[PDB]
Amino acid sequence: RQQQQQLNHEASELLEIAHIQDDLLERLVADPRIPEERKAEIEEFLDGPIRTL
């Protein structure tokens, strides 16, 4: 049970961070006040491995 919970906990935390990152990326791309040049740069660094908080 200990080994199960430790993995379910690591997946729960990483999923919480991933959803934050997805909410950010979506909002930044859609934001009218963001220049196009920057958006492509945001999509490169956020649409991949999960970043630190």
Partner: protein, 313 residues
């Protein structure tokens, strides 16, 4: 861009054929005639910025009369072109260049003057298409960025000769500055961006625009499909969309916005890499102009656009 450069060469070498047709115009009275035509063919264009729209038709007819064969008042004595085949070919050349010089030394200083000059150039082009090809010839040489084409630095030719191709005004001594050169280039395409959208109202014209608004779509497409120059591109792009973005939005509803939600994502990051922070003035205002338009979903009418109130008083 072979298709465009071929057409570019045609207007260029075809104007050069005109350089050859009146070489005989280059006696005591023969010099008086050359001045009288060069004079009575460039003063009217210089007054287009300083007149009331109710009176602006006077200059159009005065240009149309002189150019169609009729006489016109220049000073005290009357001038004509009838039975003056070199004078006719001579006036079309100086007229076409004066339209560009005005976009070079007046529209650069005052952006509002592009529209009253564009309508008159658009109506004369409409009635006399040869004058229009000469208008494109000088516009192209003095401003290659209006073709559009970026001239490349070449080996085997002097540096000064290459700087002239870029449109830098050079006296025999030295080249002109860059800040005054960017203004000359702006004013020239704000004039051109106004020509491709405005139409001379009077005359009851059945036919199509001489140089239609179609040439405005390709120009934007043709400069965004090539790598941008550091400062020119970001400047000329702004003062083109501000002048002709409204007329381009109406004609191409969805296709223009797709092209506009593209520069923000793809072409804007490209300009940040090539330009140092010291000369970002072009790219920084290129975004201030959009961010409003993007959320407003509308491009303001160019400040200085002609309205009906202009044509009555």
């Amino acid at each position: 861009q072979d298709i465009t450069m071929q057409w570019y060469q045609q207007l260029q070498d075809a104007s050069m054929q005109c350089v050859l047709t009146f070489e005989g115009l280059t006696d005591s009275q023969a010099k008086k005639i050359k001045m009288d035509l060069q004079k009575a063919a460039t003063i009217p264009v210089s007054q287009i910025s300083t007149i009331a729209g109710s009176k602006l038709k006077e200059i159009f007819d005065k240009i149309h009369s002189l150019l169609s064969g009729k006489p016109v008042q220049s000073g005290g004595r009357s001038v004509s072109v009838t039975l003056n085949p070199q004078g006719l070919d001579f006036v079309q050349y100086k007229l076409a260049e004066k339209f560009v010089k005005q976009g070079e030394e007046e529209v650069a200083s005052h952006h509002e003057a592009a529209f009253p000059i564009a309508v008159v150039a658009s109506g004369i082009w409409e009635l006399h298409p040869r004058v229009g090809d000469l208008i494109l010839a000088h516009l192209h040489k003095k401003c290659p960025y209006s073709v559009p084409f970026y001239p490349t630095f070449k080996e085997g030719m002097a540096l000064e000769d290459y700087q002239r191709m870029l449109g830098y005004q050079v006296k025999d001594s030295k080249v002109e500055q860059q800040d005054n050169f960017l203004k000359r280039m702006s004013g020239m395409i704000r004039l051109y961006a106004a020509i491709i959208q405005l139409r001379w109202p009077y005359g009851n014209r059945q036919e199509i625009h001489p140089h239609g608004l179609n040439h405005g779509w390709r120009w934007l497409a043709q400069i965004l499909n090539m790598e941008p120059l550091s400062d020119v591109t970001a400047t000329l792009l702004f003062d083109f969309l501000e002048v002709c973005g409204n007329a381009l939005m109406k004609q191409y509803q969805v296709q223009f916005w797709k092209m506009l939600i593209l520069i923000k994502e793809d072409y804007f990051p490209r300009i940040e890499a090539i330009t140092s922070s010291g000369q970002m003035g072009s790219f920084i205002r290129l975004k201030q102009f959009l961010e409003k338009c993007l959320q407003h979903k509308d491009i303001p009418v160019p400040k200085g656009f002609l309205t009906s109130s202009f044509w009555r008083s």
